[PDB]
Amino acid sequence: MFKAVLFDLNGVITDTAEYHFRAWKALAEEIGINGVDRQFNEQLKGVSREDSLQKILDLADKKVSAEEFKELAKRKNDNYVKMIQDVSPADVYPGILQLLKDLRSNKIKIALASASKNGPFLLERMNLTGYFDAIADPAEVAASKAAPDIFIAAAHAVGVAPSESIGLEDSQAGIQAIKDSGALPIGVGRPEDLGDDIVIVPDTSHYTLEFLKEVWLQK
Amino acid sequence: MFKAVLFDLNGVITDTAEYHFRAWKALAEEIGINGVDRQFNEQLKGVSREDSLQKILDLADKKVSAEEFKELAKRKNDNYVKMIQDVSPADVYPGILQLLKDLRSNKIKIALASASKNGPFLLERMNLTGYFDAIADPAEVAASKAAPDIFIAAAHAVGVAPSESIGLEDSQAGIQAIKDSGALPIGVGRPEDLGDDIVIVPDTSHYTLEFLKEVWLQK
Ligand SMILES: [Mg+2]
Ligand SMILES: [Mg+2]
C-alpha cells in the first residue's frame, strides 16, 4: 500500500488562482489598463510574475522604467497577500478535509508539494496544518515547474521514496512532475486537459481513501 | 420577457462529443495512427468530418486516395451512428427536462439550434421531440464556427426574432454565434473558457426558468 500522499495546493486543496487573478486585475485597473479578464488570465497561469507583468503591460503597449517594473511586481504580491487574509476552512475543496483525516487515521504520511510561497499560511488559515507531516519549501528546491524536485522533496521530508507515494494534481505540468518523481499521479479535472494515461477524477469529492487504494492496487 | 429559448445539443442537452471521440479513435487504431487521444480530440471540435480526418492523417504524414479518404470518413460516421443507437432519456443532462416542461407550461418557444446532423434522431431517442416547436436544419445553413445562422434560423422557425430569445451554449464559438445572432447567451462552463462579459452557470442544473427570467430582467 502507498505510504504517503503528496498534495499540490491550488486546484486540489483550495483555490489560490482566484486571488492571483484579482490581484493582477486590481493592479491593472490601478494603472488603468483594460482587458485583464478571466480568459486573459489563462495566459498568466503557470507563468512567472515578470512574464505575467510583461503580458499585462503589452495590453496597453504601456512603457515603464526598471524601477516602475520592480514596484508593480512588488505591488501585485502585496495585493495577493492582502486578499488571502480572507482564506478560511470554508475554502477547503470538497472531500479534502475528510481525506486528510482518513489518511492520518491510517498512518499514511501527508506532505504538501506546492510552489506556493504562502503554503504554511494558507494551511494554517484553513486549519489543516495539523494533518501535514511536511511542507516542501519551494525556496529550498528552486526548480522549474515541470521538474520532479518539489515532489521528491515532499516525499523525502516525510521519510518515504516517491515510489511509495501518490501525488494529487490538477495540472498537466504537475502530473508530469509527479510521473518524473516516481510517484503515482491521480489527476482532478477533464481528460481533455490531463491525458488518457492516468487515473483522473472529475472533482475532489472523488479523492477518497478507498478510491486511492483501489487505484494503487490496480497499477 | 423572452419568447423563445434556442438550445445547442452537445454539452447542453446531452453529450455526443464522447461518441465522436470513440469513433475517431477506433478509426485511427484501424489505420495504425497513434496520438488520437482526448487532448488531440480538442482540435476536432467544430471541425468538418473531412477536415478532422485530414488532421488525423497528418499525425503520421499519411496519404490516401480521394477514394479511400471518402471511405474512412464514411466508416467513422457509420460507427458514430451505430454508437448513438444507445442514446436514451437517461442521457439528458440534469435540469434540462424540467426546464423544457417549465418553458412549455409558460408558452415559451423551444427550438434546437445545433450543428448536429442527427438532432431530430437524438431528440426522438431522448423523448424530447414533444417539447420542441422547431429544429433548425444545419444542412441549410453555414458551417462556420460562431456563425449566427443556425440561431437565426431556429428563432425564425418558431416565429420570433433572435432579439426575443435566449441561447444556451457550452462553447466559446457558440456564445459568439448567439451574440452575433442578436439573442442573449447564457453559457454553461467556465468563464476562463466562455468569457467574463456574459452570464455563465457552472453546470446545466442551474438552467432554471427562474434563473433565465432573472438574467433577462438584468440584461
Ligand atoms: Mg494545482
Ligand atoms: Mg455545445
Numbering used by the authors:
A (entry chain B), B (entry chain A): 1 to 219
Could you give the paper's own sentences about this structure?
β-Phosphoglucomutase (βPGM) uses allomorphy in the catalysis of isomerisation of β-glucose 1-phosphate to glucose 6-phosphate via β-glucose 1,6-bisphosphate. Allomorphic control of βPGM involves the isomerisation of the K145-P146 peptide bond situated within an allomorphic control loop, which leads to either fully active cis-P βPGM or partially active trans-P βPGM.
1H15N-TROSY spectra of substrate-free βPGMD10N,P146A acquired in standard NMR buffer indicate that it adopts an open conformation and is present in solution as a single trans-A βPGMD10N,P146A population, equivalent to substrate-free trans-A βPGMP146A (BMRB 2792034). In each active site, an inorganic phosphate anion is coordinated by the sidechains of K117 and R49, along with a tris molecule (derived from the crystallisation buffer) that occupies a similar location to the sugar ring of the allomorphic activators. As expected, both monomers exhibit a trans K145-A146 peptide bond with the alkylammonium sidechain of K145 located in a solvent exposed position between the cap and core domains. However, the backbone arrangement of the allomorphic control loop in each monomer is different and neither chain adopts the conformation present in substrate-free trans-A βPGMP146A (PDB 6YDK13).
